[PDB]
Symmetry: D2
């Protein structure tokens, strides 16, 4: 992932203001609502019938916080995402068999959640920076398939 | 596209509140900035070299407004997206030769712009409905390749 | 799907030379080997651990011929794919939750299988026509998501 | 790209029987026929009006030879695709603005041309190996967008 310092500044500044405990659950929950086939991976989480059921699921919220945590991790090592994510790649690919396209969709939902939250501060160049990051993390997660 | 009563009422309500000037140049600008290869289609527009040049450009802004106008038309005929978009399909496909994937990328940018432009009212079910709409439009636009 | 009369004639002539009992198993099996996350959907098939575990799997072979039968249906009803695949769309979308991208991969694998089998009779325009067909089928199977 | 030695050997062994002078032109030509929007990049090659026109084009055949030449380089340097394709990445991204999805499509057409050529030598594990190589080359080519 190649970010200019201006880009690195703007991404981290935005990041610093993310409600980590909420954003994660919102991004995971919206993934399940918007791209419904993804619910197949989380059937053990309980009731996912309605959007309300999904958005209200505390297992979804809890897990969402864990996803956001790893995201914060890659953000700290843009230099080496493959290695940062090596362990999560074996899990998601070798054990869970998640389609590589799903990693890209979660990336997308995340960018949407930020736009939604940071309105005007989510500028075109900031959107561009985050797009490159979510793409970099998605590619690092599908590494086991490469 | 298949929208549930709720989704459709939902959809058409928010649309009515859309500031096309704001959303159109924003959607079009963000496409050229986030996915740079898209600039080659708009060489006739001038200075697109920087996010500022792009976001500044009134050609971009005016064209953006035209794109939303076609969207609106589309929104009125969710029943016949294909027929609604026939002439634009011929233009984009047969004449311009735009990659069908780019119709998906504009759609996604547009969704991020609505999140951005409706904050709190852009709930998971609304995003889910708008995602079906944009995918529907992208598919109707790529119709000539099918 | 829009085929010119020359496309329709060549597509239908080639299809009549296909050994159904065989190409369907070959296409489903290659899908499972080349895009390994797809194995997660074939819950009762047993060992899918090695290419030979997959390719000679009796259930893969039997199942491939049912897939092939459905494709034939498709080809015979290009004017009505959504209707033709109505119950298969609800099974795959509503019940099985197959990601739409997967429908596309299987179409791509089938095309490769025909190339492998027909060699030189698989000309560029025949390939282009088959591409439009498999894309139309994938689109009709993902109907319930639209 | 992760290839087992078994895969590596099956891959290089087959590459050795490729008609260097022909497969390239076939691949490129089928790209232009099957995904017609790619014709916009080769409008200076002359007449691409028809499949026959495309497949006939001597510019296409000559250019296919160079493409295949680049592929052999990648094959010879699986451990250094990014360096191997450094200059080609700057040409295609920075200079030509080719959409990254098109690199993917070319790799896919190539695999189909190999299938079409090798019949039976093109077994499921060989196809899987080739799919990982093409994906790795497409990703290396798109590096400038990352
Ligand atoms: C691309 C961004 C993603 C990140 C950063 C991420 C991160 C994580 C993390 C941190 C965990 C918990 C690891 C542990 O408990 O050791 C996890 C587990 C899991 N993830 Fe993801 N993930 C991503 C994408 C996805 C996608 C797209 C899906 C499926 C649609 C998915 C499905 C799962 C599942 C099923 C589990 C296991 C949860 C359980 O049963 O405890 N992940 N992921
Ligand atoms: C969401 C899908 C899209 C819609 C609804 C749309 C709509 C339109 C409209 C309404 C026009 C004006 C045609 C006229 O009145 O003469 C137009 C033209 C054009 N579109 Fe799009 N468009 C879409 C996607 C795209 C994409 C993805 C690209 C390229 C990346 C693109 C490139 C162009 C170009 C180059 C023109 C011609 C501009 C000129 O020189 O006049 N469009 N489009
Ligand atoms: C390209 C289009 C496809 C066609 C025409 C097709 C066709 C079929 C047909 C005819 C059946 C049997 C329905 C019945 O029970 O009567 C079936 C079942 C099934 N398909 Fe597909 N399919 C397609 C793609 C896929 C893909 C991409 C996946 C997953 C990767 C998939 C997974 C399944 C599963 C898991 C079943 C049920 C098998 C069982 O009986 O356990 N299908 N499909
Ligand atoms: C993905 C694998 C690809 C490889 C290995 C590849 C390789 C090459 C090579 C070796 C050249 C000659 C560069 C030089 O020495 O001037 C070239 C040029 C070119 N390629 Fe590609 N290419 C690939 C994909 C594509 C795609 C998908 C497109 C567009 C659809 C494309 C469009 C072009 C164009 C327009 C040129 C310039 C032709 C000229 O004027 O010489 N390339 N490519």
């Amino acid at each position: 992932v190649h970010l200019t310092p201006e880009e690195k500044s703007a991404v981290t500044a935005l990041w610093g203001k993310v409600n980590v405990d909420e954003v994660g659950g919102e991004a995971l929950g919206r993934l399940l609502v918007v791209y419904p086939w993804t619910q197949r991976f989380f059937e053990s989480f309980g009731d996912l019938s309605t959007p309300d059921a999904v958005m209200g699921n505390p297992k979804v919220k809890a897990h969402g916080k864990k996803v956001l945590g790893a995201f914060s991790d890659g953000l700290a090592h843009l230099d080496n995402l493959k290695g940062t994510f090596a362990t999560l790649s074996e899990l998601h690919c070798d054990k869970l068999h998640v389609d590589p396209e799903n990693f890209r969709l979660l990336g997308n939902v995340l960018v949407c959640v930020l736009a939604h939250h940071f309105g005007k501060e989510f500028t075109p160049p900031v959107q561009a920076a985050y797009q490159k990051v979510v793409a970099g993390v998605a590619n690092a997660l599908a590494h086991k398939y490469h």
